[PDB]
A paper describes a structure:
Compared to the RdRPs of other Flaviviridae representatives such as the NS5 of the Japanese encephalitis virus (JEV) and dengue virus (DENV) in the Flavivirus genus and the [name] of the hepatitis C virus (HCV) of the Hepacivirus genus, the pestivirus [name] contains a unique ∼90-residue N-terminal domain (NTD) that does not have notable sequence homology to any other viral or host proteins. The global conformation of our CSFV [name] structures is consistent with the recently reported CSFV structure with an RMSD value of 0.9 Å (95% coverage) between the reported structure and our representative C-682 structure. These structures together reveal that the NTD adopts a globular α/β fold with an α-β-α-β-β-α pattern. The NTD interacts with the palm of the RdRP core intra-molecularly with a mixture of hydrophobic and hydrogen bonding interactions. Collectively, these biochemical data indicated that the RNA synthesis fidelity of CSFV [name] is fine-tuned by its NTD through the intra-molecular interactions with the RdRP palm.
To better understand the nature of the NTD–RdRP intra-molecular interface interactions and whether they regulate the RdRP fidelity, we designed point mutations at the Y471 and E472 sites in the context of the WT [name] and the N- and C-terminal deletion mutants. Crystallization screenings were performed for all the NTD containing mutant constructs and four of them were successfully crystallized with one construct crystallized under two different conditions. Among these five structures, three of them ([name] and two forms of C-672_[name]) maintain the WT conformation with the NTD–RdRP intra-molecular interface maintained. The NTD–RdRP intra-molecular interactions are fully disrupted, and the NTD is rather involved in a non-intensive three-way interaction involving two symmetry-related neighboring [name] molecules in the crystal lattice. These structural data together suggest that the selection of Y471-E472 mutation sites is valid in perturbing the NTD–RdRP interface, but the interface may not necessarily be fully disrupted by some of the mutations. The effect of E472A mutation was highly consistent with AA mutation (compare lanes 4/8/14/18 to 5/9/15/19), while the effect of [name] mutation was slightly smaller than that of the E472A and AA mutations (compare lanes 3/7/13/17 to 4/8/14/18 and 5/9/15/19). Although NTD–RdRP disengagement, a situation mimicked by the crystallographic open conformation state in a crystal lattice or the N-91 construct in solution, results in fidelity reduction, engaged NTD–RdRP with perturbation from point mutations can achieve similar level of fidelity reduction.
Author numbering: 13 to 125, 131 to 531, 538 to 670
The structure:
């Protein structure tokens, strides 16, 4: 009866190792009585206990006392600064004002010297149909400096999470089972041309950096190569990261993205090393941080969003009663421990050539304890954790996440590490992800996994009944802020597309953070993902019919060469005209938020179709005739030119 209070309390106990020297009892076992707790040091949901005719309520109180005693005996151990970073001291000009409780705020340096706006064409397309933009949810809002200081105190300002003893030994036991020995010690850095190929010249400037990436590349490339050598030999350098709030002017991505969802998952606190330091890290570790080739099992950072759910359902279909168990770690970046970072270090040393291990052993040391500069000049010393702007973020988090989840899953079920790829499939993109396995294993892992994942220091989001999110049918999987939605093509074949709430799609489509060429690029980018949504599909076509003489802009996720309907068929595998049905039920779910907020009218759907037909019945070759129902209504079809989709 009193069993849950033990389970909730067990999520607060310090991680311990196997203690065979005493009796280790379960949370349900404690609720049965005749058991008095002997230590709040917990291991796999068990604690050392003695049998002594106890009342349950007493056992909890002794545990509450055991835990409270330790909490007031293991708080403020103390923050220390590493010598290799002493150089930052000489830069303080004023006293510190962060009022941090767990990390040093040694002072402030001297300072140096964006709005949410609507896309004029798209927005005029929506409004003309009765969509009320004001009713759409806010997206990509910025935050004030006072919330920023409190945000850092709220989420960053935390000591490293305690982890189970010897864990990283076990995590290496898992990695050895999925190493790719045909590549051991085979990675080398790439040359300047390969690095500059896929790069944004507008890469974010450091706090002490004046020039962007494109400027740093065009003129100070020699400076970057100097950084590498000092690291190549194990020499300290001026490592610092700049802290700005998400959607500040310098929240700019160095590398390509798969969609707007990546920006949505960025923490409230963006932390990145200098443009020059990022370039040095990227030129050296290119094959890792960009996962070329992919050696992280189930890493979907390169999988385009329109492929992922087709790719997964092919795995889904091979199980007897599959479930998908979601990973939902609370603010992952703040939970990377120092010991976790050397686990990636020891892994990066595995795949890199012998001539770079000193580089890695050194750069890890800096990342063990990083000096960070706020936008306003306040300086704090972060104990470990992952900076969202580091080049190793997605690569390092992803490989970190798989090992951690496999450990939690395998130890929860009894499945041996070497047998995993046989009884389960996993897919991750940074901290977000899930695993597929049989309902038996999935329900077992989902119930015990929350506590185990607390013992490894990756606490999950508080959920109902302390159980991980379990998907029992395919299109309930949630991944990368999207979810599978079925479509049936004209040839009676089925595929899945990335589904998402209609409200969210409209908002992210109608806005930007501070031209008509751009809006056609957005229209195409959204069309590749959301052609299942008849509202979006037709809005997108209308924008594409707008001033056909203009070429599409190239600043966003995708753009097209030539006729766009061809580009759709090139990557999707079917012509847009072949979309005959969108999954009936799932569309109802995703459109509900539209009616919840009242963002549309009872005739909005019809007014949009009727708006598209008006442009479509006129004689000639019109984009809107790609829509099967529009073409069914106009009697004419769209005949595509040549087309190609490019990033």
């Amino acid at each position: 009866n009193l069993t849950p209070l033990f389970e909730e309390l067990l999520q607060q106990c310090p991680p311990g190792g196997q203690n065979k020297t005493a009796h280790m009892v379960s949370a349900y076992q404690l609720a049965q009585g005749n058991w008095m707790p002997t230590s709040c040091h917990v291991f796999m949901g068990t604690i050392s206990a003695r049998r002594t005719k106890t009342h349950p309520y007493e056992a909890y109180v002794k545990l509450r006392e055991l835990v409270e005693e330790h909490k007031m005996k293991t708080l403020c151990p103390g923050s220390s600064l590493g010598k290799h970073n002493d150089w930052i001291i000489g830069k303080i000009k004023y006293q510190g004002n962060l009022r941090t409780k767990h990390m040093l705020n040694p002072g402030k340096v001297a300072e140096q010297l964006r709005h949410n706006v609507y896309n004029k064409t798209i927005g005029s397309v929506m409004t003309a149909t009765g969509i009320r933009l004001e009713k759409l949810p806010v997206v990509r809002a910025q935050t004030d400096t006072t919330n920023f200081h409190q945000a850092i105190r709220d989420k960053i300002d935390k000591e490293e999470n305690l982890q189970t003893p010897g864990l990283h030994k076990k995590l290496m036991e898992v990695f050895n089972a999925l190493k790719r020995p045909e590549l051991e010690s085979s990675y080398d850095a790439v040359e300047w041309e390969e690095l500059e190929r896929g790069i944004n010249r507008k890469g974010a400037a450091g706090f002490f950096e004046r020039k962007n990436i494109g400027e740093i590349l065009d003129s100070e490339k020699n400076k970057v190569e100097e950084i590498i050598d000092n690291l190549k030999k194990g020499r300290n350098i001026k490592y610092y990261e700049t802290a700005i709030p998400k959607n500040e002017k310098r929240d700019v991505n160095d590398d390509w993205t798969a969609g707007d969802f990546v920006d949505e998952k960025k923490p409230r606190v963006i932390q990145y090393p200098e443009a020059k330091t990022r370039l040095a890290i990227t030129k050296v570790m290119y094959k890792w941080v960009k996962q070329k080739p992919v050696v992280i099992p189930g890493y979907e950072g390169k999988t385009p969003l329109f492929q992922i759910f087709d790719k997964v359902k092919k795995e889904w279909d091979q199980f007897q009663n599959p479930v998908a168990v979601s990973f939902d770690t609370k603010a992952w970046d703040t939970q990377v421990t120092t010991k976790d970072l050397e686990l990636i270090k020891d892994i990066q040393k595995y795949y890199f050539k012998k001539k770079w291990h000193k580089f890695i052993d050194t750069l890890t040391m800096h990342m063990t304890e990083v000096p960070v500069i706020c936008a306003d000049g306040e300086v704090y010393i972060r104990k470990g954790q992952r900076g969202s702007g580091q080049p190793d973020t997605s690569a390092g988090n992803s490989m970190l996440n798989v090992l951690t989840m496999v450990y939690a899953f395998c130890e929860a079920t009894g499945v041996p590490y070497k047998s995993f790829d046989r009884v389960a499939k996993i897919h991750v993109c940074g901290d977000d992800g899930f695993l597929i396995t049989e309902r038996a294993l999935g329900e077992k892992f989902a119930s015990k996994g929350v506590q185990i994942l607390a013992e490894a220091g990756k606490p999950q989001k508080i959920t109902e009944g302390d159980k991980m999110k379990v998907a029992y049918q395919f299109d309930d999987i949630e991944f990368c802020s999207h979810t599978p939605i079925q479509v049936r093509w004209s040839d009676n074949t089925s595929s899945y597309m990335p589904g998402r709430n209609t409200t969210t799609i409209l908002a992210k489509m109608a806005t930007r953070l501070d031209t008509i060429a751009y809006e056609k690029a957005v229209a195409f980018s959204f069309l590749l993902m959301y052609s299942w949504n008849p509202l979006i599909r037709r809005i997108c076509l209308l924008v594409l019919s707008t001033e056909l003489q203009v070429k599409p802009g190239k600043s966003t996720t995708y753009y097209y060469e030539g006729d766009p309907i061809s580009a759709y068929k090139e990557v999707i595998g079917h012509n847009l005209f072949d979309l005959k049905r969108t999954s009936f039920e799932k569309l109802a779910k995703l459109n509900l938020s539209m009616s919840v907020l009242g963002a549309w009218t009872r005739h909005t759907s019809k007014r949009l179709l009727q708006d598209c037909v008006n442009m479509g019945v006129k004689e000639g070759n019109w984009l809107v005739n790609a829509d099967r129902l529009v073409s069914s209504k106009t009697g004419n079809r769209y005949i595509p030119g040549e087309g190609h989709t490019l990033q």
